[PDB]
Amino acid sequence: PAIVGDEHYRVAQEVIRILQRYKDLQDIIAILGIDELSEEDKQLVNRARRIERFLSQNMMAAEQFTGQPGSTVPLKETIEAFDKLTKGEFDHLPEQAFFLIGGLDDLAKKAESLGAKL
Amino acid sequence: PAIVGDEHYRVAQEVIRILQRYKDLQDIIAILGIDELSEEDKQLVNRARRIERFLSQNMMAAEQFTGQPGSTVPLKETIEAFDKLTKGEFDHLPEQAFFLIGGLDDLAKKAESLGAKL
Amino acid sequence: LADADAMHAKALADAKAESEKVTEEAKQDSERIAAQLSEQAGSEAERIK
Amino acid sequence: ATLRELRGRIRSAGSIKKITKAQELIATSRIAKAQARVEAARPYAAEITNMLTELAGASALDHPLLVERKQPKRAGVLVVSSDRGLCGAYNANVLRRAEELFSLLRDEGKDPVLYVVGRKALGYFSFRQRTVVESWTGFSERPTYENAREIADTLVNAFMAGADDEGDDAGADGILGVDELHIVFTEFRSMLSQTAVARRAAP
Amino acid sequence: TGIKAIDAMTPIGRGQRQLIIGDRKTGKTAVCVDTILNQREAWLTGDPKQQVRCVYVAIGQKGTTIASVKRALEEGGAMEYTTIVAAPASDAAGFKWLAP
Amino acid sequence: EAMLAKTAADNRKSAEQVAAAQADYEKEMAEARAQASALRDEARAAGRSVVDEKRAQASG
Amino acid sequence: DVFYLHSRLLERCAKLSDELGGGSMTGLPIIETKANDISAFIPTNVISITDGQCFLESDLFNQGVRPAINVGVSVSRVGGAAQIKAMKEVAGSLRLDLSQYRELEAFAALDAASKAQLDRGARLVELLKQPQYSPLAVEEQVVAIFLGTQGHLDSVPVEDVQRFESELLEHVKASHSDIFDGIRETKKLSEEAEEKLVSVINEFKKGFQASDGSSVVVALDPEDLEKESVKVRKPAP
Amino acid sequence: YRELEAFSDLDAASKAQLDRGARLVELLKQPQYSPLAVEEQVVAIF
Ligand SMILES: Nc1ncnc2c1ncn2[C@@H]1O[C@H](COP(=O)(O)OP(=O)(O)OP(=O)(O)O)[C@@H](O)[C@H]1O
Ligand SMILES: [Mg+2]
């Protein structure tokens, strides 16, 4: 928090906590799937899957592979977007809406193309 | 049985059997939960948890690590108490009543402090 | 009905009294907190010097 | 310690595997038991349907249970879920269909009034903080006609109490009721297909 | 040490060896540096029966990491009662073996 | 008839009004508590501002 | 002789007798494990030399448990002798209680006693969290652990525990500062000091807000919607 | 018996196998320093 600010640190720590809980629950999920978890854990797992997909990005150097131009996300937008994710503001969007995109505008466009409205 | 006598040997063997079965069921309980065990298995698990707690003892040399003075349990009392435990005569007490105590009197006092009755 | 009216009036009066008391206590706590934090800041400034 | 940990995990996974295979076979037998119960219940249902048909064909259709209400704004919904959890997505599918029905009722400007069967739906709605007017649990495995009679009695009493209600006022009844009864439950299409469905039971 | 989790559950006395053991980036250096900094009041008392003199031995550490530790000690005033024995990564194996 | 109706209304209103008085007590308690918490929060925020200001000045 | 290398190094950290001046040297050796393998050669060597260990986890660190002390495995071999009387009194069996709580939480992953144990353990875990560069004086630590183990956090929600603690400590620092003075000077918590602290806690609970503000004192397609009907043998009227 | 050891709503044959296996397992047990003559073993196994 000294260097990157209090909100950056808080959002990063919440993302890390959610992903750590998902990693812990992988043992149960590999056998029984998601449906044996509690409601809190089910919600957290959905949030974590969306978060891990949203950490991916269409890179500039990846265009040669996929043909898709890369994206740049300002740090402030990244912090805002992951704060919204950690609070469950995008839980209704499908998981693939968060995959290989840039900021929140890309998220809206891809969700709309899939069928969900942000 | 020849050296320690039939009662001591039988009680020890029954304790060992219960603990072995509990060890076998531990992972089942961890993954699928305890509600999916049979009634006999659930009863055995309750008994085994109480037995393992009651095998612990407030040791004389451990006071510096707990502040609690130690206790000494005569062999006859130990055999009697573990016979009762294996028979299920203390299943009505919380398992926390069995943690770091001496003989049966200490068990009764701690159960009273926890609201249970022995 | 009479008992309920009396009990309600008493409860409301006691609520007002307790609200005043807690508010003034909170004001005193805030004053002491400000004083202590000012002392702590002064110590920090001396350390910087 | 890597090898020791892996060996412990192998033993744990073997135990889980044995338990799951046993439970699968037990569920296979339980499916036959449940189908036998459905078959046993078939004839009474068919014949009582015939009796109702005759009575309706020889009487006037003025029963409040049979006539809708005007500008309805309350529909009772009974969500039938399980008690144990080792079912794959049964409870999730039931609750998703219930949510679809709730959205549909919201479209019709009607606030759903929730009744629940089974513990899993209780947990779901408690997490969502949605109120449950009444709940019955502990028989989803082997429901008897006693439980169904109690549930239907409660729902019908609520629906009747909804006749005199005005706005949010209970009215002459003294208790607020509902204008509709829907049932959300899983329909046993076949051994392979099990579909959650919403079915308006009244009016 | 000023850390509840340690002072309450794994208390450290004077003359004791307490091992801080864990994977990388788990907070080991943070715990040790916090412990060193906590002795500031004891030092300010001026009573040698209460004062604690700290020695921070850095073995095989990156030079800028040791500089960061020294800066943290400076800011908290600990550097007055602290000595750093530095054997950075660039040093020969002899210094790394010998520093403790 | 008016006496009986008024008595039924009296029982109902007295019960609901006792409940309402208790709820109003709790509401006043919550409002006063929130006021106290807000005073403490703003006081500590002002203190933090003062310490930051004076530390910055000392550094300069 | 790699074990000897560290054994002769760490054995020089001692507490001298009065005849040698009563000086002391406390050692805080650090050991890095790989993939949480305390069974590696050097970690096992050192663990068998020192007087206890604080074992830190990446898993606990990521969960927000910071410092990431693994309570079950971490121990001090001096124990109460390395604590002041008040800390001993309040933290007498905290580590053992937390170990039992972790065991139960894994088991219960339920009677009233188990619920109470889980609640208290969650509150204690919250209490032991601490930011970096935020030392707590021994008296403040004593008061915090007193909040924890004496059951004064049971009414407080888990998510607020930390905040509660801080606020309460601030309160005791702003007013009733003689509690800290007494603990620091006498190295123990007097019975009347304990009573004053309990009264202060109970009073402060009146003015504390939880996260929710609570008091701590004490569309389906209509066609798919199948419709029940009554069969009637009549001409369409 | 070891196949069925994971399991009561079974076939009559399965229940009989389970009970028989439990009895056989209990039969194969033996205390220390207690060797049996071959004929006694034959009768017990019978
Ligand atoms: N109590 C704490 N609360 C929050 N962050 C902490 C805490 N302790 C340490 N950290 C942070 O965790 C990270 C790792 O800390 P630290 O450098 O002390 O760990 P380490 O185990 O010594 O690491 P390394 O492997 O780099 O030597 C740093 O960002 C430090 O700021
Ligand atoms: Mg380090």
Rg of chain H on CA atoms, in Å: 14
Tokens of residue E31, six digits:
């715990």
The CA E86 to ligand 2 mean position distance, Å, reads 14
Tokens of residue G7, six digits:
């054994």
**Residue C7 near residue F18 (C-beta atoms within 8 A):** yes
Q: Tell me, what amino acid is at B19? A: L
State the CB neighbour count (10 A cutoff) for residue D159.
23
Do residue H6 and residue D18 have CB atoms under 8 angstroms apart?
Answer: yes
Could you list the active site residues of G?
77
**Residue B54 near residue B91 (C-beta atoms within 8 A):** no
DSSP annotation of F9 = H
Q: Which of A90, A94, A106 is nearest to A57 (CA)?
A: A106
Ligand 1 touching residue G67 (CB < 6 A): yes
Distance from CA of A29 to the nearest CA of B (A): 10
Residue D81, Cβ density class (10 Å: 0-12 exposed, 13-18 middle, ≥19 buried)? buried
Residues 6+ apart with CB under 8 A from G135: E1, E2, E3, E34, E37, E38
Helices G191-204 and G161-174: angle between axes, nearest 10 degrees: 120
CA angle C31, C34, C39 (to 5 degrees): 130
Residue of G nearest to F33 (CA): G207
Residue the block writes with tokens 């606990």: G60
Q: Which of D129, D127, D128, D132 is nearest to D117 (CA)?
A: D132
- Chain A residues near residue G59 by CB distance under 8 angstroms: 20, 24
State the CB neighbour count (10 A cutoff) for residue E47.
9
Tokens of residue C2, six digits:
């009479």
Classify the C-alpha dihedral G92-G95-G101-G107 as positive or negative. Answer: negative
Best residue in D5, D9, D11, D12 for a mutation probing chain B (most B CBs within 10 Å): D12
Residue the block writes with tokens 């924890």: G148
CA distances from G208 to B56, G128, G129 (A): 41, 20, 20
**Residue B70 near residue B63 (C-beta atoms within 8 A):** yes
Beta bridge partners of E83: E55
Q: Which of F57, E36, F53, E38 is nearest to C49 (CA)?
A: F57
DSSP-derived pairing of the beta strands D194-202 and E54-59: unpaired
Residues 6+ apart with CB under 8 A from B39: none
Ligand 1 touching residue E4 (CB < 6 A): no
Beta bridge partners of G24: G15
Residues 6+ apart with CB under 8 A from F46: C34
**Residue G168 near residue G127 (C-beta atoms within 8 A):** no
Q: Which of B50, B48, B55 is nearest to B23 (CA)?
A: B48
DSSP codes, D139-203: -SSS--HHHHHHHHHHHHHHHHHTSS-BTTB-GGGSS---SEEEEEEEEE-SSS-EEEEEEEEE-
Helices G191-204 and G138-149: angle between axes, nearest 10 degrees: 70
Q: Tell me, what amino acid is at A44? A: L
Q: How far apart are CA G59 and CA G36, in angstroms?
A: 10
Q: Which of A68, C19, B30 is nearest to G104 (CA)?
A: B30
Ligand 1 touching residue E30 (CB < 6 A): yes
User: Strand, coil or helix: what is D94?
Assistant: helix
- B65 and chain G: CB distance < 8 Å anywhere? yes
**Residue G30 near residue E58 (C-beta atoms within 8 A):** no
Do residue G15 and residue E14 have CB atoms under 8 angstroms apart?
Answer: yes
Helices A39-54 and D119-127: angle between axes, nearest 10 degrees: 60
**Residue G31 near residue G42 (C-beta atoms within 8 A):** yes
The CA D1 to ligand 2 mean position distance, Å, reads 25
Q: Tell me, what amino acid is at D130? A: R
Q: Which of E28, E32, G123, G65 is nearest to A13 (CA)?
A: G65
Ligand 1 touching residue E25 (CB < 6 A): yes
The most distant pair of C-alpha atoms in chain E lies apart, rounded to whole Å, by 40
CA distances from D63 to C15, D53, D203, E19 (A): 54, 14, 10, 82
**Residue G99 near residue G109 (C-beta atoms within 8 A):** no
Residue of A nearest to G62 (CA): A17
Q: How far apart are CA C11 and CA G121, in angstroms?
A: 38
Q: How far apart are CA D64 and CA D203, in angstroms?
A: 8
Q: Where are the beta strands (DSSP E) in D59-104?
A: 74-80
Tokens of residue E33, six digits:
């540096």
Tokens of residue H7, six digits:
């399991």
Residues 6+ apart with CB under 8 A from G102: G71, G72, G121
Proximal ligand: closest to the CA of G131 = 1
Residues 6+ apart with CB under 8 A from D81: D90, D91, D94, D95, D116, D117, D118, D119, D120, D121, D122, D124, D140
Q: Tell me, what amino acid is at D88? A: G
Count Cβ–Cβ pairs < 8 Å, chain E vs chain G. Answer: 190
Q: How far apart are CA D90 and CA B83, in angstroms?
A: 45
Classify the C-alpha dihedral A62-A68-A69-A72 as positive or negative. Answer: negative
DSSP annotation of D115 = E
Residues 6+ apart with CB under 8 A from E92: none
Residue the block writes with tokens 């449906």: A35
Resolution (A): 2.5
Distance from CA of F4 to the nearest CA of C (A): 15
What HEC string does chain G produce? Answer: CHHHHHHHHHCCCCECCHHHCCCECCECCEEECCCCCCCCHHHHHHHCCCCEEEEECHHHHHCCCCCCECCCCCEECCHHHHCCHHHHHHCCCHHHHHHHHHHHHHHCCCCHHHHHHHHHHHHHHHHHCCCCCCCCCHHHHHHHHHHHHCCCCCCCCHHHHHHHHHHHHHHHHHCCCHHHHHHHHHCCCCHHHHHHHHHHHHHHHHHCECCCCCECCCCCCCCCCEECCCCCCCCCC
The CA E28 to ligand 1 mean position distance, Å, reads 6
Residue D34, Cβ density class (10 Å: 0-12 exposed, 13-18 middle, ≥19 buried)? middle
DSSP-derived pairing of the beta strands D180-188 and D194-202: antiparallel
**Residue D117 near residue D78 (C-beta atoms within 8 A):** yes
Helix (H) or strand (E) holding D136: strand D134-136
Residue the block writes with tokens 């006539």: D67
**Residue G76 near residue E18 (C-beta atoms within 8 A):** yes
Residues 6+ apart with CB under 8 A from D169: D176
Residues 6+ apart with CB under 8 A from G95: E8, E9, E10, G71, G74, G75
Tokens of residue G69, six digits:
């002390």
Tokens of residue D20, six digits:
């799951």
Of the partner residues A31, A33, A39, the one whose CB lies closest to the CB of residue D124: A39
Q: How far apart are CA B99 and CA G175, in angstroms?
A: 40
Classify the C-alpha dihedral H35-H40-H43-H44 as positive or negative. Answer: negative
Count Cβ–Cβ pairs < 8 Å, chain A vs chain B. Answer: 4
Beta bridge partners of D186: D196
Residues 6+ apart with CB under 8 A from E25: G58, G61
Method: cryo-EM
User: Strand, coil or helix: what is D114?
Assistant: strand
**Residue A12 near residue A1 (C-beta atoms within 8 A):** no
- Chain F residues near residue C24 by CB distance under 8 angstroms: none
Phi, psi of G154 (to 5 degrees): -65, -40
Q: How far apart are CA E71 and CA G61, in angstroms?
A: 25
Of the partner residues F17, F18, F25, the one whose CB lies closest to the CB of residue C15: F25
- Which letter, b or e, does each residue of B34-57 get, where b requires 16 or more Cβ atoms within 10 Å of its Cβ? bebbeeebeebbbbbbbbbbbeeb
**Residue E35 near residue E20 (C-beta atoms within 8 A):** no
**Residue D199 near residue G228 (C-beta atoms within 8 A):** yes
What HEC string does B34-101 produce? Answer: HHHCCHHHHHHHHHHHHHHHHHCCCCHHHHHHHCCCCCCCCHHHHHHHHHHHHHCCCCCCCHHHHCCC
**Residue B101 near residue B73 (C-beta atoms within 8 A):** no
**Sheet of D194-202, strand order:** D134-136, D111-117, D74-80, D180-188, D194-202, G226-227
